[PDB]
Structure 1
Amino acid sequence: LRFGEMERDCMIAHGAASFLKERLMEASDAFRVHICGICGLMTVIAKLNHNQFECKGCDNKIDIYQIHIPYAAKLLFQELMAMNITPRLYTDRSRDF
């Protein structure tokens, strides 16, 4: 069944901060992509059974992290990449405010 918009609402109302993260990640989607500490875009090569992570283009095999995002988003982000707008994903920060 669809846990819809109309309900994301009703739960936000309740506080249920991580049970909301379950129905959206465990109980559907969910993933494991490899991103980059430079190009904020799922692009590195996951040769795990060998532990070789590369992101040629920005030639580095060190600055490399890992994420738990919905396949959907993953898509949305590949889709935005075709229309040529890079949605770099970062884990550091620089605002604060």
Structure 2
Amino acid sequence: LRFGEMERDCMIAHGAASFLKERLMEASDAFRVHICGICGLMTVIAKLNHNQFECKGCDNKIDIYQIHIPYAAKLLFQELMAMNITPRLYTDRSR
């Protein structure tokens, strides 16, 4: 069943943060991508058995992070890129 925005607002009101994530991560779509530490995109080619990661051309081989987001998000970001917009995903707090 659709857990729509109109319901989400009711979970926010209540203050239940964890449930509201669980219900939008474990149930429905969750996903694991690899982000580059220099450029904040999904360029990284995940060779997940030879440990070799590499953000090619971009010349990175070390700075790479595993993150947990919904697939519908990843999808949204790829679509935004294909439309020629870079949505940078960074990991550390300050600028």
- Give the TM-score range, shorter chain: over 0.9
The SS at the match of 1:52 is coil
Q: Contact (CA 8 Å) 2:38, 2:60: kept in 1 or not?
A: no
Count of residues in Structure 1 that have an aligned counterpart in Structure 2: 95
Q: CA RMSD in A?
A: 0.9
Mark the runs of 5 or more structure 1 residues left unpaired by the alignment: none
Shift of 1:43: 1.4
5 Å-filtered alignment, 1:1-97, equals 1-94=1-94
The SS at the match of 1:89 is strand
Could you tell me how far apart the structure 2 residues matched to 1:25 and 1:43 are? 23
1:35-63 alpha-carbon deviations (Å, 9 max, x no partner):
11011011101101111101002111100
- Normalising by structure 2, we get a TM-score of 0.96
Higher strand proportion: 2
- Normalising by structure 1, we get a TM-score of 0.94
Mark the runs of 5 or more structure 2 residues left unpaired by the alignment: none
Q: What percentage of residue pairs aligned between the two structures are identical? A: 100
| Poorly superposed stretches of 4+, deviation over 4 Å | none
